[PDB]
Amino acid sequence: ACQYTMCEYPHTVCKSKGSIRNESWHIDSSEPLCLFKKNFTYNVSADWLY
Amino acid sequence: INSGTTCSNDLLYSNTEVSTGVCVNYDLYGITGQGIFKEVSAAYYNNWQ
Numbered sequence: 001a002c003q004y005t006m007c008e009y010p011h012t013v014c015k016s017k018g019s020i021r022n023e024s025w026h027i028d029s030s031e032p033l034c035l036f037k038k039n040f041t042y043n044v045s046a047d048w049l050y
Numbered sequence: 051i052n053s054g055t056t057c058s059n060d061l062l063y064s065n066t067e068v069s070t071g072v073c074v075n076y077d078l079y080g081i082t083g084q085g086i087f088k089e090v091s092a093a094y095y096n097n098w099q
């Protein structure tokens with residue numbers, strides 16, 4: 001949770017076999033005003049997420 | 051200044067002084083009160099409780 005500079009047309013690009021595009025959903029390379037920053041873990045083999 | 055994450059202390063002890071058998075004050079994770087502690091063997095807490 002930060003103060004990002006979002007795009008007009010955001011998308012993502014997969015990492016298993018990357019596509020022709022470039023994952024460009026923001027450009028805020030200013031280590032901006034991040035109010036929250038966290039990392040949690042989950043099972044890779046579990047089918048559903050909630 | 052006055053915005054962000056890297057705050058200073060402002061806080062109390064966090065003392066490992068759990069004194070059972072007597073009556074104490076407590077401010078545990080936000081909840082305040084007075085009570086008597088007593089140690090016991092339990093397993094129903096999970097890793098987010």
Ligand SMILES: *[C@@H]1O[C@H](CO)[C@@H](O[C@@H]2O[C@H](CO)[C@@H](O)[C@H](O)[C@H]2NC(C)=O)[C@H](O)[C@H]1NC(C)=O
Nearest residue numbers: 001014015023031034036037038039040041055
């Ligand atoms: C949360 O996890 C992500 C991914 O594991 C971390 O992002 C990496 O950060 C390192 C150090 O800055 C970079 O060298 C990597 O390139 C980053 N990976 C990706 C995919 O962006 C992130 O730093 C972690 N956040 C915290 C707070 O630990």
Ligand SMILES: *[C@@H]1O[C@H](CO)[C@@H](O)[C@H](O)[C@H]1NC(C)=O
Nearest residue numbers: 013018019020021022023024
């Ligand atoms: C993606 O980024 C790389 C490195 O900046 C660049 O060489 C490549 O042309 C970019 N892809 C597209 C479709 O613009």
Ligand SMILES: *[C@@H]1O[C@H](CO)[C@@H](O)[C@H](O)[C@H]1NC(C)=O
Nearest residue numbers: 041042043044045046047048
């Ligand atoms: C969750 O992770 C454990 C540890 O590897 C694994 O044994 C289990 O199969 C995973 N759950 C599912 C639904 O795959």
